[PDB]
Write a protein that binds this ligand. Structure first.
Ligand code: CA
Ligand code: CA
Length: 123
């Protein structure tokens, strides 16, 4: 679920405010997205967007009770490291990994403030 994804980002980037810093950035970070990514962070979000699209088409996930935004899974944060629990079912496990990869990607790229709130004519 989104609140668990927020927890993962914090696990990796303690000094961030997830829902604020990674929203309305580039052509892909935030609800929706399309066009040419403007930088590396924008590319992480393009990848995460595609992962969620795949999860919504997974057979093990029930239509739209098991969606990525509200499906809770089991995970743990150990020394700024993220672990998806083996007690999770198939659908829960795929979503946990989408979030895990994004949290890591975010922690490995630069944040360019000049790319906040760009108009669509630039994508
Ligand atoms: Ca997006
Ligand atoms: Ca669940």
């Amino acid at each position: 679920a989104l609140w668990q994804f927020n927890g993962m980002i914090k696990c990796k980037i303690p000094s961030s405010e997830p829902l604020l810093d990674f929203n309305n950035y580039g052509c892909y970070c935030g609800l929706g997205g399309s066009g040419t990514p403007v930088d590396d962070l924008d590319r992480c979000c393009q990848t995460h967007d595609n992962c969620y699209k795949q999860a919504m088409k997974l057979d093990s996930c029930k239509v739209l009770v098991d969606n990525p935004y509200t499906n809770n899974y089991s995970y743990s944060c150990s020394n700024n490291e993220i672990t998806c629990s083996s007690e999770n079912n198939a659908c829960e496990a795929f979503i946990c990994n989408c979030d895990r990869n994004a949290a890591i990607c975010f922690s490995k790229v630069p944040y360019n403030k000049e790319h906040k709130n760009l108009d669509m004519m630039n994508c």
